[PDB]
Amino acid sequence: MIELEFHDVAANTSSTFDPEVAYANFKRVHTTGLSYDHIRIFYIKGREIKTSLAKRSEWEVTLNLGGWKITVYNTNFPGNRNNPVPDDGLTLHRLSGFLARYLLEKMLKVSEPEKLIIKSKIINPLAEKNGITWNDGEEVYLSFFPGSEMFLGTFRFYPLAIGIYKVQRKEMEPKYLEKTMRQRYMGLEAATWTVSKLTEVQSALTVVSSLGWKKTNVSAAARDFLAK
Amino acid sequence: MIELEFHDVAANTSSTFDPEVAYANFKRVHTTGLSYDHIRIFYIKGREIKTSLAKRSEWEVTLNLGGWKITVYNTNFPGNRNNPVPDDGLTLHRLSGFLARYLLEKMLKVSEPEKLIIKSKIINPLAEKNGITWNDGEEVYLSFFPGSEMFLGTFRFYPLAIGIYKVQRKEMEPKYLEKTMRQRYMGLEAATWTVSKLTEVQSALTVVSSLGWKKTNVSAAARDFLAK
Amino acid sequence: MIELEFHDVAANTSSTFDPEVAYANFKRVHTTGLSYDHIRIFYIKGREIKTSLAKRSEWEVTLNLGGWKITVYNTNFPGNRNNPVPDDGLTLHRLSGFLARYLLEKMLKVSEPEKLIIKSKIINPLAEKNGITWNDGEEVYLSFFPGSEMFLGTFRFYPLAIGIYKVQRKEMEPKYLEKTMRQRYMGLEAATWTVSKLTEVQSALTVVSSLGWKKTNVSAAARDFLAK
């Protein structure tokens, strides 16, 4: 006689990481060659990179984002999700966030013409679809990237505010905002900032609800001609 | 000289049972400890329970649906299908139906807040995939379970109506509706209710074609925060 | 270890054709049965033909524009765009342009009463929406058709002028005027006519900005009665 037991559904993936420390490791190791051409490549083909990782079976995959090259923990393969990725890991998710943190810093530590190189080249699919483009503010724009949610202190609650903005107009499910609520704003953890800095997340939501900008590029005689 | 004979294909499994009486036996024996946590466990892992029974070779298997425990005639093993399971038997199929009858009664004999405990906990994979969730009506929702087809009087032709709804949009094969046509609506048998209560099955089909609802759950500070 | 590369966005479809020669081929092969009833049919249902081609998966589709029948390279299906269509090809786009060239010639080589048969029957959706109708000049009217842009010598820069007129009041994106800049005015290529014949495109823009006319048709006793 065989007896065999069955149970309840998951609680989704929680923070099984230190985000500020994982962003450190990324920043230290990877951003050494990394440039705006390589970064835009990651965002643009963000669609395809997510698919191609979910295609492949291997646990350690490299992305060749132009010449720049990153090692990514593939958690996107079916089999591979629910195998804990280290405290220092990169995933598609974390990596996207990490590039977005890298940039939100960049956008607030670099020259206004260097920032225009950022603003032309980097194209954010999630941001662009919901209107938002660079002009609306860098901090707003960058938080549409997934993985931004790990760190809410930098962006000042715009990842959560966006999260909240998608759910209340029925676009994203409540449950992915469980992962967000299990992240830090500064060094404060889940429950504390939840009410302490409620009014932050309110103003941040108010802001990101409206905003929109748009841009175009490419050819050279055509560019010039057309302008007049 | 050896002579040896060959023949035609089956007629599929027919009612080799009394369904109202098999549901009695279930109800009497099993629903004595059985609770909404145990029930949801059966539905949720309905996917895995079907697989795990089809894996195992043994003819009598027990399911440990939380603490609650049921003895199931395994007919799901390859070898084991086409060995008649008694008139009082439980199979995966019958059992699922039997839990769904148990509930359709429950949903119409229990308090509206107790019904909300049902409506949160029990998640029906077959119902959820084709949209349907509790709000659309209990009787509709429960008939997506297989084994519901044994008893058409309780649900009022929704098992057959669903059956019919899957076949006409090419999702299920005609032949599983041969088993359904060999079941009872009330105490009437196959042929009689087929035309007598044709207009029942029509209105029932009309109903179950549209319907959809959805729900989400889990965390506690996150729940509260998110709500506003 | 799998390594896999990602890159930058397209440059849009460029002239992968000879337009004057593709219009030749069209003119030779197709305009042999083609009549004003068939032509108007193409324009009128220009809306639906674009949709129906983008619906279908097949690479060679025929349009049955009344009795008249044309073979069109379907580049409008999702899958099918970015598969080069020959130097002699017809696409929805090219074809529309080609009918518009056919006509702009017709409108300047046919009798003024035959031109009135053209002017009643052919209805140009893109032209009509932005006011323009036949009276404003044939050359103006016909250039609203897409595919007109391939040949700028015939119309005398009205396709580009219109293009420019849509972009500067925010109606069309800059990038479709990259395709236009990669076409010929007479036999001159992109860069040369860009500045050489700048003042052509200026006067042409000045013209097409204002213009509007309108018409009505159908019934017979009603027509007559109403007139008085």
Author numbering:
A (entry chain B), B (entry chain A), C (entry chain C): 1 to 228
Quote the study that presented this structure, word for word:
Based on a cryo-EM average at 13 Å resolution and subsequent fitting of NP crystal structures by molecular dynamics, we were able to generate a pseudo-atomic model of the NP portion of the RNP. Given the absence of long, straight NP sections amenable to helical reconstruction, ~135,000 short NP sections were selected and processed using a single particle approach. Therefore, these numbers were applied for a final reconstruction with local searches, resulting in a 13 Å average that converged on a −105.26° twist and 18.25 Å rise. To preserve these aspects of the structure, we produced a model of what we termed ‘split’ NP that contained the core of a single NP monomer and the bound arms of its two neighbors. The NP structure was symmetrized, and molecular dynamics were applied to restrain the ‘split’ NP. This allowed freedom of movement of the linker region of each terminal arm, which had already been shown to be flexible while minimizing alterations to the globular core of the protein or the binding regions of the arms. A limitation of this approach was that it prevented us from modeling the viral RNA along the NP arms, and therefore, we did not include it in our model. Displaying the surface coulombic potential of the helical model confirms that the positively charged RNA-binding groove of each monomer is aligned in a way that maintains an RNA-binding channel along with the interior of the entire helical filament. Furthermore, these rungs were too far apart (approximately 18 Å) to permit intermolecular interactions of any kind between NP monomers along the longitudinal axis. Our model suggests that the helical arrangement of BUNV RNP is dictated by lateral NP-NP interactions and does not involve longitudinal NP-NP interactions, providing a molecular explanation of the RNP flexibility. However, by comparing these NP-NP contacts with those within the native helical NP, 7 novel residues were identified between laterally adjacent NP monomers with sidechains potentially involved in weak H-bond or salt bridge interactions within the RNP helix.
Bunyamwera virus (BUNV) is the prototypic orthobunyavirus that serves as a tractable model for the Bunyavirales order. Each segment is encapsidated by multiple copies of the nucleocapsid protein (NP) to form a ribonucleoprotein (RNP), which associates with the virus-encoded RNA-dependent RNA polymerase (RdRp; L). RNPs serve as the active templates for all viral RNA synthesis activities and represent the form in which the RNA segments are packaged into virions. The BUNV NP comprises a globular core with N- and C-terminal lobes bisected by a positively charged RNA-binding groove, accommodating approximately 11 RNA bases.
